[PDB]
């Protein structure tokens, strides 16, 4: 997250921190995700496509810091790593960038809700807030485009919803953006998602309820003029989600 503010897991209790164990034992950060039910975390396919093997992955819930433990965190293995069959890699514009991780502890349990671990609601089908709506993004991603390191503390920021028409401008993203994608940016382009934020939640308040409206997917650079963050439009994948979480 470029700009924005530091936060803790109490303020995004569904946020999932996902890591991969390398051979030789090193564990590095992969991507964020969102807990939608006790046994299921939703993320982006592009986080996993290079390494599709579910045994390489570690998920944490209730975790506030990147390389240290948070009191009351839970640690999970991935019982199922489900990628979207119709995924595509553009140069930027990943189509169908949605993935589901079935989580289970070494003790055979799913998530147990608490002050730091809760689930997020899915939207109702094709029901998105109007452009100009303010939504929040959450992640451990880069704080400046030139940074080498990821921040140790979890961050959040607020970005505004950009209409499909506007994101379609040639001087924005043109045809790269589809109706299954959502664009969102800052009016001053000061704040944005960046490298490492992928898979994480875009949460909007939608008629009284915190809602997983999007999933961080791609963008050109970070916090650049006319170059918004792009998000998987969750309200367009509910059949996909409901069938696969069975
Ligand atoms: N604007 C976004 N929603 C977004 C930009 C972005 C960039 C990278 N990246 O640095 O490769 C990764 C994920 C991203 N998500």
UniProtKB/Swiss-Prot annotation:
The modification Phosphoserine is found at residue 145. Glycans are attached at residue 144. The active site is at residues 46, 97, 198. Disulfide bonds join 31-47, 39-110, 135-204, 167-183, 194-222. Residues 1-246 form the Peptidase S1 domain. This is Urokinase-type plasminogen activator chain B. It comes from Homo sapiens. The gene is PLAU. The chain holds residues 179 to 424 of 431 of the full protein.
